[PDB]
Amino acid sequence: KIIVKHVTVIGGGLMGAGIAQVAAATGHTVVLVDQTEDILAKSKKGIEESLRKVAKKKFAENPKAGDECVEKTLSTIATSTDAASVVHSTDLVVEAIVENLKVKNELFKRLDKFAAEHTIFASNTSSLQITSIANATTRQDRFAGLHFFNPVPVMKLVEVIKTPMTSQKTFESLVDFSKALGKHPVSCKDTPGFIVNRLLVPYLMEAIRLYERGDASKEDIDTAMKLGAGYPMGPFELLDYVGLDTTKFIVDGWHEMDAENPLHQPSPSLNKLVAENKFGKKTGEGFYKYK
Amino acid sequence: KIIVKHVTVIGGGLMGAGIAQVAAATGHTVVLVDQTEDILAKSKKGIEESLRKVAKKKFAENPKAGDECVEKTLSTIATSTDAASVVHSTDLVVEAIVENLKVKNELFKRLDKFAAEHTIFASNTSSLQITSIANATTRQDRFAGLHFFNPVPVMKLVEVIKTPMTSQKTFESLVDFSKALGKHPVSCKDTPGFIVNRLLVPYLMEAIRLYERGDASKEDIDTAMKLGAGYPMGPFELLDYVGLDTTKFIVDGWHEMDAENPLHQPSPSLNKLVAENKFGKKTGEGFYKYK
């Protein structure tokens, strides 16, 4: 077995920054990648703040212990603008960039040329088939899905997605990496939505439709699911939380691939809010208004 | 206004006994009705057992008061095998008997004739349209749905279902009664599944279909929804908890009412388990095995 030690995370966004943070907090050597030195300086800054925040809470009685912790983690996170320049010596590539098939494929097709033989490639995509991306390389046996959830440093789940090509060796290594990250890996075929989103998102849509249909208010629907089902957040609160634009995007993809399917039918209320640029807590307003 | 004080609960079952227990515990006068004295004696005994389990904890420092509290609450619950003789002057009738439109309609058609003028009629049905029972009487303005959740004495939620004929006065009276019960009422029209089941059940079926499709194991699916969505129980753990037969029965109802909708398509796996009488925890086995 080849133990994942060096990880190259591509994408300075919220997801990739958190993936890097957790990988580094658990002793992995990390290289975060994005287009500009400024974008990277900012991403790594978000990580620093997150770490100090977790520090002033873990070592709330010993600031020095906290500084050392933060420092030790932040030091094992390097940054580069061209991933091709570091994958020749990396054990794992975790991609978390724009949800565009062409862009992702161009990325992996090139990295395939630089990455060492044993290097494994994984995408954190929520809206594309892992296979579609794997076939942009001739390393499909070492390519798979590694799907995290926001906030990455907190959510313990990680879906390890195997395509009909991924090798058992690649899978196991990713299962071990997940555990090494302090996460709990689960397995799912390379089908749309995998497990979590496949069961969560359609439900959220139903909540929206029941509301649009006028059967009940958003407030009661949230109250109903929190008190009646024990959910941390009612569906509308959660929609605003995960992003209305993010939600609409995933569902549009499922709808495009299967229009006759009523479960992916667009929502006038969802589309309207996204068109009015009300993405939820991201913009201070979605179904509900925020401070 | 119409302040509910005397309540007639029809159905010695788990739910009915729970409604009776909570109404009595909150200072309402209660009459629990069922078919035989043996049934009643049993149901009332369960209530006492549940009431005592609670007291031993809350009144540990003063067992005297605890016993008094349990006794007071018990004496406030009466029993009868003749609903017609009880409803002559009761304020509210909460029906929680067998999920069968015929039986329910005979009971109400009968009670409508013996009940006082102001008396309100309500059903705790999960598998039937409230309107399909209210018409079995000529008191539709005082007929509505009052949907509770097991364990009734614990679950603070209650859905108040107002049909197109239901009075605003009846609705409000039911809303105040719910608060008087120490519950939190939410409103919803008389549509299948109301709020909670409408959004919960179909999701549970989707988890089953995902598993039957061979996409993931039950174990990973439950882990995914708990760690990934923060749910108290995984979908299969919850199916066993709420009863596989109970679930199947409701889905069959929705399926027959509209065999076109994909969400209500029968599950071969669900049907099999029900067939071989494996309804979940209330049987020691369903998707998982217990004790």
From Swiss-Prot, chains A, B:
It comes from the Eukaryota. The modification N6-succinyllysine is found at residues 57-58, 64, 113, 162, 169, 179, 183, 189, 218, 289. Keywords: Acetylation, Differentiation, Disease variant, Fatty acid metabolism, Hydroxylation, Lipid metabolism, Mitochondrion, NAD, Oxidoreductase, Spermatogenesis, Transferase, Transit peptide. Changing residue 235 to L: In HHF4; loss of 3-hydroxyacyl-CoA dehydrogenase activity. Optimum at neutral pH. GO terms for biological process: cell differentiation; fatty acid beta-oxidation; negative regulation of insulin secretion; positive regulation of cold-induced thermogenesis; regulation of insulin secretion; response to activity; response to insulin; response to xenobiotic stimulus. It catalyses: a (3S)-3-hydroxyacyl-CoA + NAD(+) = a 3-oxoacyl-CoA + NADH + H(+); (3S)-3-hydroxybutanoyl-CoA + NAD(+) = acetoacetyl-CoA + NADH + H(+); (3S)-hydroxydecanoyl-CoA + NAD(+) = 3-oxodecanoyl-CoA + NADH + H(+); (3S)-hydroxyhexadecanoyl-CoA + NAD(+) = 3-oxohexadecanoyl-CoA + NADH + H(+). The record marks 147 as: Important for catalytic activity. Succinylation at Lys-58, adjacent to a coenzyme A binding site. Desuccinylated by SIRT5. It is found in: Mitochondrion matrix. InterPro entries: 3-OHacyl-CoA_DH, 3-OHacyl-CoA_DH_CS, 3-OHacyl-CoA_DH_NAD-bd, 3HC_DH_C, 6-PGluconate_DH-like_C_sf, 6PGD_dom2, Mito_3-hydroxyacyl-CoA_DH, NAD(P)-bd_dom_sf. NAD(+) binds at residues 11-16, 34, 99, 104, 126, 150, 282. The modification N6-(2-hydroxyisobutyryl)lysine is found at residue 104. Transmembrane segments: none annotated. Its EC number is 1.1.1.35. Changing residue 203 to H: Found in a patient with Reye-like syndrome; loss of 3-hydroxyacyl-CoA dehydrogenase activity. Does not affect dimerization. Mitochondrial fatty acid beta-oxidation enzyme that catalyzes the third step of the beta-oxidation cycle for medium and short-chain 3-hydroxy fatty acyl-CoAs (C4 to C10). Plays a role in the control of insulin secretion by inhibiting the activation of glutamate dehydrogenase 1 (GLUD1), an enzyme that has an important role in regulating amino acid-induced insulin secretion. Plays a role in the maintenance of normal spermatogenesis through the reduction of fatty acid accumulation in the testes. Belongs to the 3-hydroxyacyl-CoA dehydrogenase family. This is Hydroxyacyl-coenzyme A dehydrogenase, mitochondrial. The gene is HADH.
